[PDB]
């Protein structure tokens, strides 16, 4: 699954989840999209689970766009240790996702097929999601 090929720094501080998404808020590529309603750290395994769900629904047909990338290192101390003694080991990668962000888009598939696929995908995510269709509003951005 997804992760940065190389990095300038191995560990990043946790930081915040304030506000709406910076950008990525409009349909860019496909016809139908899945937009986040709540802020979260979406994991690489979560992203891949949603993608492969979509992939299976299409029987390899259609096109899938992933508009979030997990570049934030997720760190965790080994089990049953005490506080202190330096920062824990990097154990995975996450993508910071704030409300309004278009995480996924699909195209080249029927409306019924996109809707259901994007619905199944939403079930793999730890947040509430919405299904949207490309609009003049999108194309105007």
């Amino acid at each position: 699954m997804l992760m940065p090929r190389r990095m300038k720094y191995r560990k990043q501080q946790r930081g915040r989840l304030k506000g709406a998404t910076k950008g990525g808020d409009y349909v860019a590529f496909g016809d139908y999209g899945l937009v986040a309603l709540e802020p979260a750290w979406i994991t690489a395994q979560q992203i891949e689970a949603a993608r492969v769900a979509m992939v299976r629904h299409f029987r390899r047909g259609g096109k899938i766009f992933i508009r979030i990338f997990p570049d934030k290192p997720y760190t965790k101390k080994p089990l049953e240790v005490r506080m202190g003694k330096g920062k824990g080991n990097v154990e995975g990668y996450v993508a910071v996702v704030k409300p309004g962000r278009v995480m996924f888009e699909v195209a080249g598939v029927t409306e019924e097929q996109a809707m259901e696929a994007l619905r199944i995908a939403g079930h793999k995510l730890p947040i509430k999601t919405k299904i949207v269709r490309r609009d003049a509003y999108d194309e105007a951005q």
Binding site: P78, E80, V81, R82, G84, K85, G86, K87
Partner: protein, 83 residues
Amino acid sequence: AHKKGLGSTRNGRDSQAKRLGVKRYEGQVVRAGNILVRQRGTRFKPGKNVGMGRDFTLFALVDGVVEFQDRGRLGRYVHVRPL
């Protein structure tokens, strides 16, 4: 009660803060010798009646009033205006 072994950090170091920066602001009365700017490199350049020490420190050559001046590509300058 089991106390599992822990590792360590190679990072603990950091150096003393150097209290860098402008020490006298525009319109302030200064006496000859007064330090105006502490800086790394020529973040600010000496102007009229202002000298620069070996460590880029700006100071007053005359009794006067400090004035700043922004000159674009030429840089930023600190002057002392005699009273």
